[PDB]
């Protein structure tokens, strides 16, 4: 029941400061522009201890499956090869990606009927708000 409130299909409805976040991460111009247009559907499911998060959009379709606290390899939508660990901290899913001596954290939170995604790279945060699809 660990992620009950996250499970479901969610659609992006707003984004703030995402271009700057992507710049800070190192994403190039053309990828930033096409990625920034995307309105993904995020599909979260749980089967036993395995959590799956899919992101489907015109830009890219991605899928990760993981166990909390157990590091895994991820190829991000912008093609970084990262080492990821996802944990639950006080009801927030905290996803840390490490690559090339850099780090970024993506937090997913349930707030009212929304799922809020906060992405941080050094001093730069972006907030992406999803609603149930
Ligand atoms: C690369 C990347 C970094 C951070 C985030 C933030 C995020 N995670 N979940 N919701 N938003 C998304 C990223 O990838 C995508 C960008 C656009 C469309 C599809 C995927």
């Amino acid at each position: 029941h660990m992620c009950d409130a996250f499970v479901g299909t969610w659609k992006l409805v707003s984004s703030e400061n995402f271009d700057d976040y992507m710049k800070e991460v190192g994403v190039g111009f053309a990828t930033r522009k096409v990625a920034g247009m995307a309105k993904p559907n995020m599909i979260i499911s749980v089967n036993g201890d395995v959590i799956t998060i899919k992101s489907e959009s015109t830009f890219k379709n991605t899928e990760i499956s993981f166990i909390l606290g157990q590091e895994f390899d991820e190829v991000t939508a912008d093609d970084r090869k990262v080492k990821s660990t996802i944990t639950l901290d006080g009801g927030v899913l905290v996803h840390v990606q490490k690559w090339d001596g850099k780090s970024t954290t993506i937090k997913r939170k349930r707030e009212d009927d929304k799922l809020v995604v906060e992405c941080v790279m050094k001093g730069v945060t972006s907030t992406r708000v999803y609603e149930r699809a």
Side-chain angles (χ1 to χ4, degrees):
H1 287 279
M2 56 190 168
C3 292
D4 278 356
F6 293 100
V7 167
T9 299
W10 298 94
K11 60 186 171 69
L12 183 71
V13 298
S14 71
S15 183
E16 173 189 32
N17 208 50
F18 191 55
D19 187 64
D20 280 346
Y21 170 79
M22 287 189 289
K23 282 185 181 182
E24 202 75 7
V25 167
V27 182
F29 180 91
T31 298
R32 291 199 313 276
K33 297 305 162 195
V34 172
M37 290 293 297
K39 293 286 184 156
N41 299 136
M42 183 188 19
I43 309 142
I44 304 180
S45 62
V46 178
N47 182 325
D49 296 332
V50 182
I51 304 164
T52 300
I53 302 177
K54 298 179 186 190
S55 182
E56 302 247 276
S57 71
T58 63
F59 169 56
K60 233 64 128 136
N61 297 328
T62 66
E63 174 183 331
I64 63 174
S65 294
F66 59 92
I67 297 172
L68 293 171
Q70 302 193 4
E71 185 170 41
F72 60 98
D73 290 320
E74 179 182 5
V75 175
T76 67
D78 60 307
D79 287 323
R80 284 172 290 129
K81 290 67 192 173
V82 309
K83 295 291 181 176
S84 289
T85 310
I86 303 180
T87 55
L88 207 44
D89 180 11
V92 177
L93 281 167
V94 181
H95 179 180
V96 181
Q97 296 174 335
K98 302 298 196 186
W99 76 107
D100 290 350
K102 299 172 181 182
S103 185
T104 188
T105 299
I106 302 167
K107 292 184 177 181
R108 303 169 172 96
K109 309 173 172 179
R110 271 296 312 272
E111 299 187 10
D112 302 317
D113 291 321
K114 299 170 177 175
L115 187 164
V116 179
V117 184
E118 294 167 354
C119 306
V120 175
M121 179 64 186
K122 294 169 297 173
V124 179
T125 304
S126 172
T127 301
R128 284 160 68 86
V129 178
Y130 292 75
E131 295 193 352
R132 298 253 185 206

